[model samples]
Target: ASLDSEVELLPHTSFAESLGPWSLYGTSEPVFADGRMCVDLPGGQGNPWDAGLVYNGVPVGEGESYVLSFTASATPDMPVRVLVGEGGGAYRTAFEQGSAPLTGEPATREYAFTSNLTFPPDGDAPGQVAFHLGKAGAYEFCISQVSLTTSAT
Candidate 1:
């Protein structure tokens, strides 16, 4: 089966203003690698409850399913969680998984979740998805691949 087409929301930015102040609250260092972009979570430098990557431009329709996948690696004991949904207010957790120890080797992980977009259909807005790192701690998440495929059911 082919993966869903994914559009990266954030590339690389040093200024928090690039992602907007209201959407994210914490210290995040996003970088670009081989044409792909990713956020590096080193030592979890922000409010665990507020720090996360939000993709607001993508529109997810109701009754549709999507799979979110990425490559990540962490220290021997640090586990990371990948979250997907609308926003902080209206969001749903799609997948939560841990990472293997960082032995200079990286591992890839994929998260699949069917979207039950719970937004009003009357508005002309696109639903969003967020990538959340579980807990506040030092870790490295290199997102080499990310995609959202439409499911045929």
Candidate 2:
């Protein structure tokens, strides 16, 4: 059975900038080129090398659901992933695409998640989007600067 619902984005939601207020975590680093953001994840980047970006320490509202819109791609034609982890907790997220490849062309995807972060301090990122590519592979993950707002529907 399916039910219809309308959702609204809570405050503090913002799109990801190409040059970043988003910080790079894990092992690999990122470089901004001619209007796109890039990261080269080579084979053997190791476990949880899980390279991605994080807009750390932001706050989220409890009991609210967010509508996430995403547009990303990979060069040499390979798979890509994006995960929205805790603004605080490290368990898991309601939005996670661990291994979906780009289609040689760019497209936007969507998902919905609850902001149930375990708030403890400012050091824990309020929300985060990690491009899961730095784990055991060689691929060029390129972002088209359209990754900022993870707004509600």
Candidate 3:
């Protein structure tokens, strides 16, 4: 089967509001630079989950597969978590990757994952995909790039 379509989701200044209610749902203040949106996560804050750029405005079909990649940087000895799922509303953790605390300058980290993250087949509302940083430590996450692709057949 041949790949059907591909889409690139980048962060923009407007994304700050789309991230959810800033008062309640901690918003992700992302800066768009070099063709990517970068979000800085401070250390020792309550599990402040922030939303990322949304993709495939439609519900993710079952049996479909997607791959998410991004660059991350953190302060020395700071741990971070990157996650992907349906949407800001019903997020089902599809991937979780972490790195050891940094010592000096921030390190560039890359993450790539492919999975059959199934979704409801019937009349289900489309979900949004987000990147959430979990843990207490000063850190910065730069979502340099993100690509979502599906199989042909």
Candidate 4:
């Protein structure tokens, strides 16, 4: 989609429908629990460490404002990370940006950030974005009603 276009890059952010563009990684499994996408971090399987994830992202543009919002919670104090850009050490060189320790009840939280990379990114650029939940503890994180929108300057 064009920059600031009304069209959403990926669909089913709400997680009410199917998995949409989202795919699971690690021990990450998307299950319908507590009425949302419950990210289950299964532990103790000859695995020294464990992390869970749910991500399917779209391209972003430089100097454009994008807001990523979602509702998440757990039995209580769910540690979730909403990743929106590329961290260092990756071939694709976009800066890292995220909101962490996203604790409390099932309320909507948002991350507003602008891309700094040059427009018309080169091959294999980090224009993508994602959401993550990683914990060694066998905890269940709940998430739903994700929204990604752009603002027209």
Candidate 5:
């Protein structure tokens, strides 16, 4: 694979009228306005995977490099876990960020890594981008300009 140009994999980069390809779990219905999607978590959850924002069908190739980035803000400072992994079945992980911090001010966060697993030949959405939001306190999390791009292959 050649690392010439980065290719955008996410179908919906911003939240306007619809969530588009994005999905939610264990979180409140997201409020979409001003090109941003804001969701609330009640907290008190012990595990980060308790609540998640996910985008499925991202095609990631084995040994390919990828960049995952997004602009986000939190009401109170919070830590979010981010991952690229299998959508179902065994749920294998390609990349994982243990703690991505968010604050009152929106900031662009980016992570780059190489994947160790490839999408199955005959699979429906074998890959996914997930933001694990179940930390310890209640807070408002807003995100926009979400992106996932891979090197040319």
Candidate 6:
């Protein structure tokens, strides 16, 4: 899809500007610099969900087509599982996709998915988009300008 005509799900663009709606799960440290956030993942973990980076309150609805885009780079390469789902409690996934195309050079990546359920549903339970990097090996991952957009259906 061209994705040229779509509306952002949130106002988020860079962590340098705001970092409230985002969170780091499990054991990890995020270094913020130059409009980007970098994380170093420890290799050999039990599960993929052992650690992750997530954006909360994504305003997605049931049956809507959404696109998640971001610029990222990795030291070597890593297999990162990207997921969109419920914000809290059980963390039910609405959509999921992943691949290990990371390289030393930075590149823009986009994932398109259709949600089968609505996020937040009611109140204070906003949906989330997460980058799961467990057992992906010890690698440096940097990301910037993360965004989620929805096209008119």
lDDT of each: 0.46, 0.53, 0.44, 0.54, 0.72, 0.69
Q: What is the lDDT of residue 106 in candidate 3?
A: 32
TM-score to native of every candidate shown: 0.53, 0.60, 0.50, 0.65, 0.80, 0.78
Q: In candidate 2, where is summed lDDT lowest over 10 consecutive residues? A: 1-10
Q: Which is the winner by TM-score between candidate 3 and candidate 6? A: 6
Q: Please report the TM-score between candidate 4 and the true structure.
A: 0.65
Arrange candidates, best lDDT first.
5, 6, 4, 2, 1, 3
| lDDT of model 5, residue 86 | 74
Residue-wise C-alpha lDDT for candidate 3, range 2-114, written one tens digit per residue: 24543433332232224222111243457656544555555356563543334433234445455443334544445554544554444564554444333334333334455
The Cα error of candidate 6 at residue 103, in Å, is: 2.7
Number of the top-ranking candidate, with lDDT as the measure: 5
Point to the candidate with the largest TM-score: 5
Residue 12 error, candidate 2, Å = 10
User: Candidate 6, 95: how far from true, in Å?
Assistant: 1.5
RMSD of each: 6.2, 5.7, 6.5, 5.2, 3.4, 2.9
TM-score of candidate 5 relative to the true fold: 0.80
RMSD of 5: 3.4
List model 4 lDDT by residue over 1-153, tens digit each.
Answer: 225554455565666555566555665567755457776554533331235444534456767766665667655454544455543335353434323655456676655666765423344443444554555433566766665666454
Q: Give the CA lDDT, 0 to 100, for residue 69 in model 2.
A: 46
Per-candidate count of clashing residue pairs (backbone under 3 Å): 5, 9, 9, 0, 0, 0
Q: After superposition, how far is residue 122 of candidate 6 from its true place, in Å?
A: 2.2
- Cα lDDT tens digits, model 1, 1-153, are 342533333442222124332143343556555543445556555444445555554445556655543444444346554554444444443333344233344544444555466443234444455555635674555444444454453
Tell me the deviation in Å of residue 54 in model 2. 1.7
- lDDT by residue (36-88, candidate 5, tens digit) is 87888765776778777877766767787677767788787866678877767
